[PDB]
């Protein structure tokens, strides 16, 4: 039952850094790794995440991995610092520059076989693993990169452990660098055949709740990779805590996926609005499912209603009864049933488990994949597109040395990712 | 006379924690085991302390480690709370294969230390779900070996049922037909229950805002209790589970009854109300008061079962079933010219501390094999096809080592099935 | 020799609000169910309760919703209170078509679980409106089912009758005159009451200076019971309600008895009075008594029922009998020699506790099938020619899919209906 | 059961908000939205208005939407700015100028989207809406623009829901644009098409009331606003209290509309004076009847006995006997039957309930059909052929693209009301 979690890059060191803040804010944990918690199911599946130390502390099941030293530092230097073992901080000195060369192929290649090795200890150390989750970038060096690598030697050794992760998605508003799309190209290419899912999460869309929801003035990372640390930690709610329904990520997995080759998912969260007004606020089941449905508050910059449902999941903390939920998301299909693809009856599945948020008396987490999420893709594979053929920045990875058939055939298999969610569509 | 109950999957485990705190509430069981009076589902310790002749499976540890945690944990004994590391995934072939495979001869061999303790075991009674995975396909590869070494022992299987409403896997058509088969060729009798329907009548006749599954287990679980607590406590007319199988199958095929129950009355509406014989009997020939979503009314009866609890005279119920004769709309089959079965306790219905259901001085159980049951049968044959059609996360039980052919088969045997319905309904 | 009460409506539903009450007042029934001693119209649990017979419908939460708030919402059973969402905006078509009619079946099916209850029923009782929508639309679609499965049971049927002045509905002609024709196909006797002729009695009789509809209930109230419950109870010479079809209606369609009745006096004017079999009955002839607006001299008379409760012996009837031959003015038609029916209970008199009228020692309820109800038909045929003629209002039905042609047919069956009492008035 | 109301422009804002506040007295609610009644009824049917939120707290069912922030902050500031929640405050930024092309054509319309998407919210949170409720302006921008752009989009996703509106009209005494009676006749166009009602009150007969029923000196928009509410909180005091007669605005509906295009209504009240006279009175219903008949007590700016009823509809609160309403309803017409239309034998409707209005031990509503009232459409098409004939002004309306024959026709459609009027009157 557990799972080993690895953060590459600035991106998966801080959204990972709010995630294990969370995680030891679940079962009780304190900044130095002590339990002082409120429940003995705080400690009864403890070990998904944690190793116990002498004297009932606890370490986190993870390694942070990156090529430079500052980003791994700043993390130490914060609570849950204290948490993490010497042992799991894997990194070199000098970053990749948002090459996917160097990162996957070169220097970060380098880093990744002492990685692994520490990943086979943690994975020996465990009874049985449950999987891997890994958070990443799509557009940067190590994030996209190097930690590509790692997921196809962590797959090469586990084959039927469930490999998932979670990625930050470019976008027009939010590009940093021009080879960006090179980068997710790339690392996408190398995802659709080495992962079992991964979750879709785009900074713009992320804004846009942060203000239109959350009525911040200044959205900050701290709290974006909030938002989806929430999310991170609602998929495996049920599994350390006791529920009713589909505890299990590989089950999740089984009604997720209808085609090997898309897994890509859109994830969401209710509730999710700002205190004003919370007082007016009244959480029944139908009000997490209006919200849940509603592609505002999707963490992917993604309109579901734009394309068609292939799966929804949704995932449910706290006490709610049966009918409740399975009636009220029967009707999101029933109302909405134009937005469902017609080849899964019943294309809702539920989750629910008996143990609420911390601050909330009861939550849920969507999970969608729709074909919608092709347009994420044609924002990626068209700005590529566009710098491949004049070879703007080429050399840059030539120098590493990457082929432009590389690059032509990870484009390709972009390509074809959009034409079977077409044919999926309809 | 005795027997033994198997719960397997969360779906069989939860079900079976209310019916083992139903069998404590009848013969006022402690927790602990202590019990100071049930020899059919006990077996006794020199301390006084009585065991559940049961055995709990889950390939996942947490719904175990519920029970585990439970009040009840003291009553069962560890043997019989067995786990695995790891769920099915919704899956047939982990749950019949893959992963039960490596649990099954454990189960087994606890399964037969109770058979061994019990003197004159009559048989058993097996609690899953059609659409898991531990329930569903461990539950077959299961059945095929108990049918190897008990054989001819009662094989009473309680599935539940997936609604369209509740659905929780996507492959669920998938899981539940090739369970089905397997079902059709090693149960004696199959009882498929629909959640949805259920919650229907806890919403009207119950009253009940929200329905969850704690409730709903309740109420099956005194249905279960009324046909063998009832049966193991002697009363007037007392039928065997051999004699189920006699009146209720007429041809080795047809082991499909289905389940109604009243009085289902919440308390609050039971005040004022009193029930006859004849007039529980009218609420059990209602398709509202029906435990599975299907309509009565549009299918034939072959057979059908009447059980009572408390306070009944055989007198009112011959009253009682000439205005079903007179009365209904029971269309019975040419084949079976009168086929009303009749078994009478005097035990009377046990009330649940906390519950949801009122206080009732008689209660009846009916079991009937009708014609209509091929309804929830075509339903779910079309949910395969489309699936099937596309071939939609066909991988993940192919992927697993299942063969094409074998989904097309277990789909094909369900049709199969229905067509006998067909024509065991068509007067001849 | 049971009944069943149906109120349909706020009309139907408040005046049954008085009408139970006196029921319990009769008996001695507490709000509770509690009674300690009625079976006609009660039925009894075990608990000791007793429950009325009894069937409330509106299509509008809202006056269900006050019974269900009254004392008296523990002696009803909640499934005998069924109410819809939204009024027919008193329209006939919403009543007996677009909303009523998914309602209905829930109401018909608690009619037959009643009827089951009952082991010999009479027959049942209905209260409404003419001019309202549940109390005139659904009603019509009402009895349109209740003719087909009870067929023969007695049909009997109360009805308000609009007056000039409460008016309501401007739509209340069309609304009154499709019902009306619906009551001809179906019921066996329809007596309607106009609450302008009531007030009338209420300012002068009982000195009433503001009379409402609560005042105006209790003494149809008492009406409705004297002669029910006074055909249950027994006394010198019963007359069942089948014998009142037998002699009330002399063809097929001439099912329309108006009621008069008396003492309807004070507390304070009757002091002093004392009125004999005889003198009470003079009452019951005198026009300014009559509970409808019309004639009663005008037309002829057909048939003529007098019940009496309390102190009444036969010959003092007979005495009464010749005085009102005598006396009057009472031109019977030569269709019909003589056609006094009486029937005579012991029953005394019942008084409401804070009640409008006087405490009487004996009763007389006046029924009769007279020529000057055609006088009120008139009133009515000339309102919707009216409104027919502009073809005011008109969309509100026929945007519900009514037919023109619908409206035209119902008003020539009336017309149709005041002809053959003309007819039968006719001497031969 | 459930009505959603929605006010529109500032006549919208302020009148709603004293309508709001009158609605929380009628059920016991304060400013927070805490429920502290007297009365178990105030709860019975609190739904029509509100939702139960967290708390026992109570949120009206209702939008406030226009295109000017301070307006809709200027309430929102007020008591009951605090009941209302922020998902219901829809607002642009810059007005419309009185243009109902800005407002209808343009600018407005880019709200009604967000705010029909809020209403939809409404609407599917009630169990069983009844009805909506407008309140809005005739000669506005966005109140008769904005307003009747929303009407025609509700009313089409809700064919059988009662479409009410109350709104104020024109005077030549008051009014304040040029541009106005062609902002009325466009809205009227409108509105006679797409609702089922509409209440017809002029600030001229107001400030009468106010000055001579009321005797003050110095009326203002906070009592005239007053007076309004009071009519608008009579017409569902049955719907929401038990009582006997005619609860439901259907009802009323199918007994005041004897053709489909007449449905422009004529409110009143009583009691109606001021103070100093009320020692001397002694309410009785012919005292009530005798107010609610009299023209000076009319809040629309039009004397009934100048025309002829078609319809007359009185609503009573309080302890009334039925006698004495029905005897003393049917006197009126049989006093002054020289002004009823002859077609309807009993014009006279009504409809009591059992509750009273703080502060009264009863009171009356009236609600008149009567053809007098195209003497107020005759002001409106007069002024307007007069400025149509010239274009004077026309250019600001043909710069948002508006066509003459757009408002040749409206002013067509208004000629049919009129002379329809003139068909029944006799
Ligand atoms: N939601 C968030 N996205 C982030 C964050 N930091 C970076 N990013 C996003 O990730 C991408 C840039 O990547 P990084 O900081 O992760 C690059 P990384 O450090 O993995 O590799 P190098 O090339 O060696 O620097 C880009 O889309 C940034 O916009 C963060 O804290 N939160
Ligand atoms: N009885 C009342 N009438 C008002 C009030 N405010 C305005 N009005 C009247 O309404 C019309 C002017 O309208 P508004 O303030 O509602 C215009 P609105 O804000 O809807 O739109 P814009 O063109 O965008 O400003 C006019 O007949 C005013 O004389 C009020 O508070 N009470
Ligand atoms: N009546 C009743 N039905 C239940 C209960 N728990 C689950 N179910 C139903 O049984 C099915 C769920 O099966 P799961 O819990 O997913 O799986 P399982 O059969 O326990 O085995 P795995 O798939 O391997 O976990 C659904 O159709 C549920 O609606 C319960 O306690 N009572
Ligand atoms: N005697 C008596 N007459 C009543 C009573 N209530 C209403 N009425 C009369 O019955 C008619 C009113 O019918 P409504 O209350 O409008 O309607 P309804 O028949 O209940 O059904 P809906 O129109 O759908 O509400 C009028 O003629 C009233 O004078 C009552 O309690 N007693
Ligand atoms: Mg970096
Ligand atoms: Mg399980
Ligand atoms: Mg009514
Ligand atoms: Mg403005």
Redesign the interface.
Known sequence: ?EIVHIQAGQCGNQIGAKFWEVISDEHGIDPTGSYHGDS?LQL?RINVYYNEAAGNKYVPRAILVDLEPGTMDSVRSGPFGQIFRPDNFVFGQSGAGNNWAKGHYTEGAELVDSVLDVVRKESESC??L?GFQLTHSLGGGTGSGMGTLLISKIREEYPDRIMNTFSVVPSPKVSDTVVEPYNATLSVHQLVENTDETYCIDNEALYDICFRTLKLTTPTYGDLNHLVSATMSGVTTCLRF?G?????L??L???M????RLHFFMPGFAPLTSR??Q?????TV?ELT?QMFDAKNMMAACDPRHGRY??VAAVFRGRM????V??QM?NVQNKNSSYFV??????????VCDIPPRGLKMSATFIGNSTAIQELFKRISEQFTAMFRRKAFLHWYTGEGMDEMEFTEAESNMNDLVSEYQQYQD | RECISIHVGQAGVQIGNACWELYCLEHGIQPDGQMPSFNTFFSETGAGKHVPRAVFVDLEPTVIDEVRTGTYRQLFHPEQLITGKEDAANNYARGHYTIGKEIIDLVLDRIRKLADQCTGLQGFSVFHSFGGGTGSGFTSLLMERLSVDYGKKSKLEFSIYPAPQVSTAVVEPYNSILTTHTTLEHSDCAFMVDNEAIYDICRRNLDIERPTYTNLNRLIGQIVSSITASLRFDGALNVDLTEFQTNLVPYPRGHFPLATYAPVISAEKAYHEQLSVAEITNACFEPANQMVKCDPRHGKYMACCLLYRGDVVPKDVNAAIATIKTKRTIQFVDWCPTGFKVGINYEPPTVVPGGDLAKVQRAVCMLSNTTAIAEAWARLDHKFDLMYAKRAFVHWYVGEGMEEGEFSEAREDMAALEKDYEEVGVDS
């Open positions: 039952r003995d009864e009874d049985c449950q006791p009713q329904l589909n505890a299990d590989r089950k997995a089984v009604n996926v209808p085609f090997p004003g007004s007082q007016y606020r009244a959480l139908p209006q292939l799966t009864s049966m009918k409740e399975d009636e029967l017609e080849w899964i009856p019943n294309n809702v599945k539920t989750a």
